[PDB]
Amino acid sequence: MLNLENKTYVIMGIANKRSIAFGVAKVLDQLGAKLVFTYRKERSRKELEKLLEQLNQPEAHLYQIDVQSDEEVINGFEQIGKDVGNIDGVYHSIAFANMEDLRGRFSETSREGFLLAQDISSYSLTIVAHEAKKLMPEGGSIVATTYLGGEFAVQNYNVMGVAKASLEANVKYLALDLGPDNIRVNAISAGPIRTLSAKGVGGFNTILKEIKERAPLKRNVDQVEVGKTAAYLLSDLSSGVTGENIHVDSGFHAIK
Amino acid sequence: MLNLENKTYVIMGIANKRSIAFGVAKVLDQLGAKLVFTYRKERSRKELEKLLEQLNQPEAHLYQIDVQSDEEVINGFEQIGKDVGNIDGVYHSIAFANMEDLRGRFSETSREGFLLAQDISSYSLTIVAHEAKKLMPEGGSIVATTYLGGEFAVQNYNVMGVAKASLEANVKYLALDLGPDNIRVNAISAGPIRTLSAKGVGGFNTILKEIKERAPLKRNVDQVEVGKTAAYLLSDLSSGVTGENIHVDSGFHAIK
Amino acid sequence: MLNLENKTYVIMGIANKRSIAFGVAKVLDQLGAKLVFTYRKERSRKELEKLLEQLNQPEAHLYQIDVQSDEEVINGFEQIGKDVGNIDGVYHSIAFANMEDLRGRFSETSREGFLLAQDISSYSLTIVAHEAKKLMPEGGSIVATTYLGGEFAVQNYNVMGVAKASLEANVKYLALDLGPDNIRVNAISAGPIRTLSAKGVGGFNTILKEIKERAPLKRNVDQVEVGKTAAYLLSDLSSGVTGENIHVDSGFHAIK
Amino acid sequence: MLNLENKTYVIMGIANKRSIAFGVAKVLDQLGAKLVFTYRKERSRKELEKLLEQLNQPEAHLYQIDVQSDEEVINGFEQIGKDVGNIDGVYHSIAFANMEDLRGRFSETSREGFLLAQDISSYSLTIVAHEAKKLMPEGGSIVATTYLGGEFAVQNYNVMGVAKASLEANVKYLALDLGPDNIRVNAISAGPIRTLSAKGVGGFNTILKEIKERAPLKRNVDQVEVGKTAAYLLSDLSSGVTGENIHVDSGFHAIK
Ligand SMILES: NC(=O)C1=CN([C@@H]2O[C@H](COP(=O)(O)OP(=O)(O)OC[C@H]3O[C@@H](n4cnc5c(N)ncnc54)[C@H](O)[C@@H]3OP(=O)(O)O)[C@@H](O)[C@H]2O)C=CC1
Ligand SMILES: NC(=O)C1=CN([C@@H]2O[C@H](COP(=O)(O)OP(=O)(O)OC[C@H]3O[C@@H](n4cnc5c(N)ncnc54)[C@H](O)[C@@H]3OP(=O)(O)O)[C@@H](O)[C@H]2O)C=CC1
Ligand SMILES: NC(=O)C1=CN([C@@H]2O[C@H](COP(=O)(O)OP(=O)(O)OC[C@H]3O[C@@H](n4cnc5c(N)ncnc54)[C@H](O)[C@@H]3OP(=O)(O)O)[C@@H](O)[C@H]2O)C=CC1
Ligand SMILES: NC(=O)C1=CN([C@@H]2O[C@H](COP(=O)(O)OP(=O)(O)OC[C@H]3O[C@@H](n4cnc5c(N)ncnc54)[C@H](O)[C@@H]3OP(=O)(O)O)[C@@H](O)[C@H]2O)C=CC1
Ligand SMILES: Cc1c(CN(C)C(=O)CCc2cnc3c(c2)CCC(=O)N3)oc2ccccc12
Ligand SMILES: Cc1c(CN(C)C(=O)CCc2cnc3c(c2)CCC(=O)N3)oc2ccccc12
Ligand SMILES: Cc1c(CN(C)C(=O)CCc2cnc3c(c2)CCC(=O)N3)oc2ccccc12
Ligand SMILES: Cc1c(CN(C)C(=O)CCc2cnc3c(c2)CCC(=O)N3)oc2ccccc12
């Protein structure tokens, strides 16, 4: 159990050493997995290669995939299959909204900002799952990252809250559709973590303080803690579990 | 309480006599409310006028608003304010997805089909709320229609399930944003009803049969039953209630 | 709709003018309903009679029923049926735990304290429903009062939180069992209100302050607001609604 | 990660080879854990010893603890601490209701039957947690078994449904109370499994058939699958997770 030595996972959404998806990569790597990484723009390839040398993987497998492009997602997973073969799962950690939409009054959200968030943060999972399934003929596990703001209205989270609720339903619909193909689809609801996606978010230290003061474990979580739950979900330990959303958040989801 | 004689409501999404929104109109009308109706295309105006004569309203207030158009939503509510004055609330009953997306494997959903459903079925509430609030300077109530498929993966509901989950989160975010303006925003989760939106949906009679056999009240609900709950939500009876999703479904939501 | 003139409701759990159940009584009374009141101990009868003269009911119908006694519940509803006839519904607002259990560490709860809370705060609904149904041969509506602490762990609520979760499940099981008899069973999740049940609860003003600062309506709710939702639930306006838990809490349930 | 060689767990509620808790024991045992077993009555000791020889544990640690007795729970965990030392966690799989209460109309449930179910199926976790914490001075993990009938009204589950809702809230309150002591408390919501607790349950094969036909994985789960999720929850893989209820049910919780 949990020896991932002959398993291969595609990880999407690493930006830097603080990325939640890099906590996932470190844990899967320590368990022996072969890892494939995707990134949005060619400008990020070098820093990502360099970051990933930390894992000492025998081969650096990196692919430019902008999930806004059908062509890039299809072509990318096809190239992954040609280069590395079939895979055992996908870790999805991609989200975006225009910054102006993460501070406004939500009622002022533009149509374009709303659809943009849905496209990147929710639809991306659907097309990734369809293309990744082609590499998983004997089944596999797909995991997406979410936040409690998809379950409750959190101040400022605004359009991303609606995008995460969409993502969370996307996970259940994919679980239903792909279950017969022995592909499980689950989410991790991570507590707040200081990453690049916290940059420009006002009052972020106040959010971190509230968890510390109120959550059952009276502390915040980190990327490795999300990564350990991701290993469980990506592995056969979680074989009977699908369409689930596991909170890795020091118990915050359970209190009011 | 519940005398709606000096109140005005805008109702969006009546297609015909079987529309859920027409059950809402009949109940509000019987309570004495003045009603304003919107419709998508000019081709539908005459049948809608004719249908609405059944309510014997002293004045027929009807406006062409395609919620896919920012201009039409802004201009429409502005014209409503000029013609009838301030309003007390809005009933939103608008949803759409391409039919091909309501029978597929969900994983095969196109980007365009996904975003289309989000645009009409979820974003429409956001822009309607922003424009309607301009007519509600002393506050008001906004109600949207949803389905259990936004909370759970239901077979075939597919892209509409993700759109309804988005709508349901939209309701909570709007409730948070507009609460300080004394505007409440709530949803009704209606059980299945044979309307125009059931047309082409395979196995619809099987869905109706399952409710009859399994729901606590052992019967299906109707449009007037949704309308009675909509009156409660649109009126001051529900003054302490916002961001809520009330199931009008014979108890089906409560069983498994 | 909502003319309750030829309807009779039994209200259980009024202690004084601040009781949530008295907000319910005032609203139902203003709607024209005939009301029957129960109370635990004979010592409370006079103050309750006096309090209830405020409603100017043509007849004072009051019954001593300690819900810990099967005999008193059976005999009480039987006497109600003999004196007033069949009823249209029951409003249940009864809860108790030993004070020592509402401040402890929850893990230190005694077996006796735990079972006491379950007995009064949850089982009471089950036996009341069974005895009340005998007075509702053409159907009716039963409503119970709950708190968000039954859905989430709230500090200090402790054994009452477990008792309310039990009550909330009791409501769904009763809804399923009694639905075929056209008896609906629902809960109201009231926000915090300064009543006799807040007495001795440390930090209660802090709880009230958090709602004011964080809930969508940025204010606390009152007993009349709960009473207006109770009228909706007790009346035919809510005819398609059962096993539901409606939050009357300024939207607090919808945020995090 | 997940090497449980220097860890000790107490497992409560094994009846025979089909017990969910025995699936838990097999998985933890294969991971290298030392196991301690409890049982209700001395009559069961021999069959349990014999069953447990299958695990080839170097020492057979078995204790008679009837969770209805405060003395037996306190004395039992105290004896466990004296014999084996500190422990790393507890797996709780104990439930009971009178059979007459699992087929009735729920509204006919006796006070004694209701409280009995609460006592064994819910309060037992509270006292076990308080006594077990004494053996976990550096922290630990407590896991309880639940069923979807604690979240929704399932036909016939009746008083056990209310008992499981109570258990599920018990888990959140314990998580809050014990979090500062670095003790995590979580539940597993297992899908239906043919065990001794299915004996006498009418229509059990129909329940199993519905999962197979409707759940995302289109199959039922087994005791080992619950055991693998229990290993995750009992180990440090789940370090940021508490007050959670993980569904091991082929995705059934996610559909309607
Ligand atoms: N940071 C937090 O507090 C939490 C974040 N989350 C969620 O976790 C996920 C990842 O968050 P992060 O905080 O680790 O984000 P960050 O470190 O900024 O990584 C964002 C990645 O998302 C990528 N990304 C963003 N947009 C796109 C796109 N259109 N196509 C492809 N990738 C895109 C972004 O470029 C970048 O990856 P690449 O460098 O591989 O491209 C997101 O889904 C986020 O919503 C959940 C709970 C708490
Ligand atoms: N029928 C059912 O089983 C249930 C439906 N619902 C929901 O109820 C709402 C209304 O459903 P309905 O079943 O009454 O739908 P229907 O009678 O077909 O009315 C649809 C309306 O939605 C309108 N509509 C659709 N797309 C658009 C658009 N882009 N802009 C403006 N209006 C649009 C459509 O034209 C039409 O109204 P107008 O004739 O006023 O335009 C929808 O939100 C639907 O998702 C919920 C539970 C159960
Ligand atoms: N106060 C609050 O913040 C909230 C209370 N609630 C709930 O509302 C319900 C009523 O609360 P309250 O705050 O109005 O309580 P209070 O005004 O103290 O009334 C308590 C009643 O509950 C009665 N009661 C208590 N125990 C028993 C018993 N064993 N048998 C019969 N009645 C019992 C108590 O005596 C008394 O009524 P009578 O005077 O009619 O007997 C309770 O179920 C409570 O848990 C919910 C949300 C917020
Ligand atoms: N079987 C199923 O379909 C499911 C069961 N569950 C739950 O799983 C748990 C265990 O179920 P099981 O189906 O494995 O039950 P079974 O194999 O009959 O074991 C019951 C144990 O619970 C014990 N038990 C029962 N009552 C008591 C008591 N008062 N004190 C101490 N132990 C008690 C019973 O004796 C026996 O253990 P011991 O032989 O160690 O004593 C229960 O909490 C049950 O509610 C959840 C989902 C699906
Ligand atoms: C917590 C929390 C986060 C972290 N989190 C859970 C997120 O999901 C962040 C998602 C995100 C998506 N798009 C952008 C940004 C963040 C900032 C930079 C940018 O230009 N676009 O973001 C918030 C935004 C507002 C309020 C709270 C939060
Ligand atoms: C129930 C139920 C409904 C009713 N319902 C709750 C809905 O929300 C229907 C929404 C809907 C949206 N767009 C379209 C259609 C229906 C049919 C005609 C069309 O061209 N587009 O629709 C289903 C579709 C699949 C499965 C179940 C259901
Ligand atoms: C809010 C809130 C309440 C109000 N509420 C929702 C309740 O349900 C109160 C229930 C209650 C039950 N039994 C007793 C008392 C209160 C105080 C007096 C007594 O001797 N026993 O009580 C709390 C107790 C602790 C923490 C928060 C709260
Ligand atoms: C599923 C399912 C189960 C399995 N399950 C999840 C359970 O939790 C069973 C719990 C249980 C508790 N007490 C007793 C029994 C079973 C049968 C023997 C006895 O004398 N008492 O039990 C049901 C009972 C009715 C309906 C469905 C179910």
Side-chain angles (χ1 to χ4, degrees):
Chain A
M1 306 179 233
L2 219 62
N3 181 334
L4 307 181
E5 275 170 21
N6 291 300
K7 312 282 195 279
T8 297
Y9 299 98
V10 173
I11 295 171
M12 315 182 67
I14 295 175
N16 67 23
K17 64 183 189 191
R18 293 191 177 289
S19 292
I20 287 162
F22 188 63
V24 176
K26 282 190 283 173
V27 169
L28 297 177
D29 169 83
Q30 285 285 183
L31 292 170
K34 178 192 280 172
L35 299 179
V36 175
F37 306 89
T38 72
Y39 60 95
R40 188 182 169 254
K41 301 156 279 154
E42 192 73 345
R43 67 149 78 99
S44 312
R45 187 186 180 92
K46 193 146 179 96
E47 288 310 295
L48 194 49
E49 279 185 28
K50 176 195 290 175
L51 172 65
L52 302 170
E53 291 164 8
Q54 286 178 31
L55 307 181
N56 204 30
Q57 288 262 135
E59 286 284 342
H61 299 294
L62 298 103
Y63 296 87
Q64 190 189 324
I65 301 185
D66 184 337
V67 295
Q68 287 202 284
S69 167
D70 291 351
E71 193 173 24
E72 287 191 29
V73 175
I74 293 158
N75 288 344
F77 280 85
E78 180 182 44
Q79 198 58 55
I80 294 167
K82 291 175 172 187
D83 294 346
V84 316
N86 292 330
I87 68 178
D88 295 283
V90 179
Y91 191 86
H92 177 290
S93 211
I94 284 164
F96 189 78
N98 296 142
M99 194 67 222
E100 59 181 10
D101 292 333
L102 300 176
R103 56 164 70 102
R105 299 197 68 171
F106 173 67
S107 60
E108 298 176 1
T109 303
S110 66
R111 195 176 305 263
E112 46 260 59
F114 187 99
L115 294 172
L116 179 64
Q118 290 287 329
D119 193 27
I120 299 175
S121 314
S122 185
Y123 181 73
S124 59
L125 186 65
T126 306
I127 187 172
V128 164
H130 181 79
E131 297 313 305
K133 159 178 169 195
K134 295 178 182 181
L135 308 185
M136 296 187 291
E138 304 208 36
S141 183
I142 296 174
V143 179
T145 314
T146 191
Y147 182 60
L148 204 53
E151 295 175 87
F152 298 90
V154 167
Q155 51 205 135
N156 297 312
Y157 202 54
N158 298 2
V159 71
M160 275 305 314
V162 186
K164 291 305 191 177
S166 173
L167 176 72
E168 285 172 32
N170 208 326
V171 164
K172 299 171 199 185
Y173 279 92
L174 289 169
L176 182 51
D177 182 27
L178 302 183
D181 301 319
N182 203 198
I183 298 170
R184 295 184 295 103
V185 187
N186 291 287
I188 296 167
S189 195
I193 303 173
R194 186 84 77 356
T195 71
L196 209 56
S197 296
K199 200 176 144 202
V201 174
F204 198 87
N205 292 359
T206 294
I207 300 175
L208 295 170
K209 189 50 76 172
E210 185 184 2
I211 307 297
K212 268 162 44 55
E213 291 182 354
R214 309 216 57 190
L217 303 182
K218 302 288 186 254
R219 65 176 183 82
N220 280 288
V221 292
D222 72 17
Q223 302 88 328
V224 166
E225 290 188 286
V226 175
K228 291 187 303 191
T229 279
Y232 157 70
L233 286 176
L234 287 163
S235 75
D236 176 71
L237 279 182
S238 58
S239 65
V241 178
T242 192
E244 188 54 288
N245 177 11
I246 297 179
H247 296 82
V248 179
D249 67 350
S250 283
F252 192 67
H253 74 280
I255 67 102
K256 201 96 170 80
Chain B
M1 306 179 233
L2 219 62
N3 181 334
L4 307 181
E5 275 170 21
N6 291 300
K7 312 282 195 279
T8 297
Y9 299 98
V10 173
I11 295 171
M12 315 182 67
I14 295 175
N16 67 23
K17 64 183 189 191
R18 293 191 177 289
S19 292
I20 287 162
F22 188 63
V24 176
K26 282 190 283 173
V27 169
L28 297 177
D29 169 83
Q30 285 285 183
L31 292 170
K34 178 192 280 172
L35 299 179
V36 175
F37 306 89
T38 72
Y39 60 95
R40 188 182 169 254
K41 301 156 279 154
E42 192 73 345
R43 67 149 78 99
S44 312
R45 187 186 180 92
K46 193 146 179 96
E47 288 310 295
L48 194 49
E49 279 185 28
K50 176 195 290 175
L51 172 65
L52 302 170
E53 291 164 8
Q54 286 178 31
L55 307 181
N56 204 30
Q57 288 262 135
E59 286 284 342
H61 299 294
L62 298 103
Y63 296 87
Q64 190 189 324
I65 301 185
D66 184 337
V67 295
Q68 287 202 284
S69 167
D70 291 351
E71 193 173 24
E72 287 191 29
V73 175
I74 293 158
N75 288 344
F77 280 85
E78 180 182 44
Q79 198 58 55
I80 294 167
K82 291 175 172 187
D83 294 346
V84 316
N86 292 330
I87 68 178
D88 295 283
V90 179
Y91 191 86
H92 177 290
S93 211
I94 284 164
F96 189 78
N98 296 142
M99 194 67 222
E100 59 181 10
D101 292 333
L102 300 176
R103 56 164 70 102
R105 299 197 68 171
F106 173 67
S107 60
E108 298 176 1
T109 303
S110 66
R111 195 176 305 263
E112 46 260 59
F114 187 99
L115 294 172
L116 179 64
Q118 290 287 329
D119 193 27
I120 299 175
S121 314
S122 185
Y123 181 73
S124 59
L125 186 65
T126 306
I127 187 172
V128 164
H130 181 79
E131 297 313 305
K133 159 178 169 195
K134 295 178 182 181
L135 308 185
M136 296 187 291
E138 304 208 36
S141 183
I142 296 174
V143 179
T145 314
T146 191
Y147 182 60
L148 204 53
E151 295 175 87
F152 298 90
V154 167
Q155 51 205 135
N156 297 312
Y157 202 54
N158 298 2
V159 71
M160 275 305 314
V162 186
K164 291 305 191 177
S166 173
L167 176 72
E168 285 172 32
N170 208 326
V171 164
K172 299 171 199 185
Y173 279 92
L174 289 169
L176 182 51
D177 182 27
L178 302 183
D181 301 319
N182 203 198
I183 298 170
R184 295 184 295 103
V185 187
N186 291 287
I188 296 167
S189 195
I193 303 173
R194 186 84 77 356
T195 71
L196 209 56
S197 296
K199 200 176 144 202
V201 174
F204 198 87
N205 292 359
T206 294
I207 300 175
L208 295 170
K209 189 50 76 172
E210 185 184 2
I211 307 297
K212 268 162 44 55
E213 291 182 354
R214 309 216 57 190
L217 303 182
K218 302 288 186 254
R219 65 176 183 82
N220 280 288
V221 292
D222 72 17
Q223 302 88 328
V224 166
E225 290 188 286
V226 175
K228 291 187 303 191
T229 279
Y232 157 70
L233 286 176
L234 287 163
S235 75
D236 176 71
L237 279 182
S238 58
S239 65
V241 178
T242 192
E244 188 54 288
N245 177 11
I246 297 179
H247 296 82
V248 179
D249 67 350
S250 283
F252 192 67
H253 74 280
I255 67 102
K256 201 96 170 80
Chain C
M1 306 179 233
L2 219 62
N3 181 334
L4 307 181
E5 275 170 21
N6 291 300
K7 312 282 195 279
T8 297
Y9 299 98
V10 173
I11 295 171
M12 315 182 67
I14 295 175
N16 67 23
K17 64 183 189 191
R18 293 191 177 289
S19 292
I20 287 162
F22 188 63
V24 176
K26 282 190 283 173
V27 169
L28 297 177
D29 169 83
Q30 285 285 183
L31 292 170
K34 178 192 280 172
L35 299 179
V36 175
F37 306 89
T38 72
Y39 60 95
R40 188 182 169 254
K41 301 156 279 154
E42 192 73 345
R43 67 149 78 99
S44 312
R45 187 186 180 92
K46 193 146 179 96
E47 288 310 295
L48 194 49
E49 279 185 28
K50 176 195 290 175
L51 172 65
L52 302 170
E53 291 164 8
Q54 286 178 31
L55 307 181
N56 204 30
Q57 288 262 135
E59 286 284 342
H61 299 294
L62 298 103
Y63 296 87
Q64 190 189 324
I65 301 185
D66 184 337
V67 295
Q68 287 202 284
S69 167
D70 291 351
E71 193 173 24
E72 287 191 29
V73 175
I74 293 158
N75 288 344
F77 280 85
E78 180 182 44
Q79 198 58 55
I80 294 167
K82 291 175 172 187
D83 294 346
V84 316
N86 292 330
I87 68 178
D88 295 283
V90 179
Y91 191 86
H92 177 290
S93 211
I94 284 164
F96 189 78
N98 296 142
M99 194 67 222
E100 59 181 10
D101 292 333
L102 300 176
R103 56 164 70 102
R105 299 197 68 171
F106 173 67
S107 60
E108 298 176 1
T109 303
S110 66
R111 195 176 305 263
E112 46 260 59
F114 187 99
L115 294 172
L116 179 64
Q118 290 287 329
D119 193 27
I120 299 175
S121 314
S122 185
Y123 181 73
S124 59
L125 186 65
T126 306
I127 187 172
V128 164
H130 181 79
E131 297 313 305
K133 159 178 169 195
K134 295 178 182 181
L135 308 185
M136 296 187 291
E138 304 208 36
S141 183
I142 296 174
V143 179
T145 314
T146 191
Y147 182 60
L148 204 53
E151 295 175 87
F152 298 90
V154 167
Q155 51 205 135
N156 297 312
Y157 202 54
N158 298 2
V159 71
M160 275 305 314
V162 186
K164 291 305 191 177
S166 173
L167 176 72
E168 285 172 32
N170 208 326
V171 164
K172 299 171 199 185
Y173 279 92
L174 289 169
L176 182 51
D177 182 27
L178 302 183
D181 301 319
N182 203 198
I183 298 170
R184 295 184 295 103
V185 187
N186 291 287
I188 296 167
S189 195
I193 303 173
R194 186 84 77 356
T195 71
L196 209 56
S197 296
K199 200 176 144 202
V201 174
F204 198 87
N205 292 359
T206 294
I207 300 175
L208 295 170
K209 189 50 76 172
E210 185 184 2
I211 307 297
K212 268 162 44 55
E213 291 182 354
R214 309 216 57 190
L217 303 182
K218 302 288 186 254
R219 65 176 183 82
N220 280 288
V221 292
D222 72 17
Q223 302 88 328
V224 166
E225 290 188 286
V226 175
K228 291 187 303 191
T229 279
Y232 157 70
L233 286 176
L234 287 163
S235 75
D236 176 71
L237 279 182
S238 58
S239 65
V241 178
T242 192
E244 188 54 288
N245 177 11
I246 297 179
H247 296 82
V248 179
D249 67 350
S250 283
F252 192 67
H253 74 280
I255 67 102
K256 201 96 170 80
Chain D
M1 306 179 233
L2 219 62
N3 181 334
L4 307 181
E5 275 170 21
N6 291 300
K7 312 282 195 279
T8 297
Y9 299 98
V10 173
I11 295 171
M12 315 182 67
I14 295 175
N16 67 23
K17 64 183 189 191
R18 293 191 177 289
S19 292
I20 287 162
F22 188 63
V24 176
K26 282 190 283 173
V27 169
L28 297 177
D29 169 83
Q30 285 285 183
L31 292 170
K34 178 192 280 172
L35 299 179
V36 175
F37 306 89
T38 72
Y39 60 95
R40 188 182 169 254
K41 301 156 279 154
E42 192 73 345
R43 67 149 78 99
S44 312
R45 187 186 180 92
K46 193 146 179 96
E47 288 310 295
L48 194 49
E49 279 185 28
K50 176 195 290 175
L51 172 65
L52 302 170
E53 291 164 8
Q54 286 178 31
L55 307 181
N56 204 30
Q57 288 262 135
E59 286 284 342
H61 299 294
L62 298 103
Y63 296 87
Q64 190 189 324
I65 301 185
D66 184 337
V67 295
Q68 287 202 284
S69 167
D70 291 351
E71 193 173 24
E72 287 191 29
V73 175
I74 293 158
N75 288 344
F77 280 85
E78 180 182 44
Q79 198 58 55
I80 294 167
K82 291 175 172 187
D83 294 346
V84 316
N86 292 330
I87 68 178
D88 295 283
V90 179
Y91 191 86
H92 177 290
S93 211
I94 284 164
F96 189 78
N98 296 142
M99 194 67 222
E100 59 181 10
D101 292 333
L102 300 176
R103 56 164 70 102
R105 299 197 68 171
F106 173 67
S107 60
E108 298 176 1
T109 303
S110 66
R111 195 176 305 263
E112 46 260 59
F114 187 99
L115 294 172
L116 179 64
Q118 290 287 329
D119 193 27
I120 299 175
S121 314
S122 185
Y123 181 73
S124 59
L125 186 65
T126 306
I127 187 172
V128 164
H130 181 79
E131 297 313 305
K133 159 178 169 195
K134 295 178 182 181
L135 308 185
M136 296 187 291
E138 304 208 36
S141 183
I142 296 174
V143 179
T145 314
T146 191
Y147 182 60
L148 204 53
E151 295 175 87
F152 298 90
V154 167
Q155 51 205 135
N156 297 312
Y157 202 54
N158 298 2
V159 71
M160 275 305 314
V162 186
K164 291 305 191 177
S166 173
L167 176 72
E168 285 172 32
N170 208 326
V171 164
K172 299 171 199 185
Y173 279 92
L174 289 169
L176 182 51
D177 182 27
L178 302 183
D181 301 319
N182 203 198
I183 298 170
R184 295 184 295 103
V185 187
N186 291 287
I188 296 167
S189 195
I193 303 173
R194 186 84 77 356
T195 71
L196 209 56
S197 296
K199 200 176 144 202
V201 174
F204 198 87
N205 292 359
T206 294
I207 300 175
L208 295 170
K209 189 50 76 172
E210 185 184 2
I211 307 297
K212 268 162 44 55
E213 291 182 354
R214 309 216 57 190
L217 303 182
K218 302 288 186 254
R219 65 176 183 82
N220 280 288
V221 292
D222 72 17
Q223 302 88 328
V224 166
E225 290 188 286
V226 175
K228 291 187 303 191
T229 279
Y232 157 70
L233 286 176
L234 287 163
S235 75
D236 176 71
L237 279 182
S238 58
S239 65
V241 178
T242 192
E244 188 54 288
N245 177 11
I246 297 179
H247 296 82
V248 179
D249 67 350
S250 283
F252 192 67
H253 74 280
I255 67 102
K256 201 96 170 80

